[PDB]
């Protein structure tokens, strides 16, 4: 699995 693009927008983290 690859969960990227969700931790490069810093929408909350």
Swiss-Prot record:
Modified residues (Leucine amide): 13
Taxonomy, superkingdom: Eukaryota
Summary of the function given for this chain in its UniProt record: Obestatin may be the ligand for GPR39. May have an appetite-reducing effect resulting in decreased food intake. May reduce gastric emptying activity and jejunal motility.
Name of the molecule in the record: Obestatin
Gene label: Ghrl
Boundaries of the shown chain within the full protein: 86 to 98 of 117
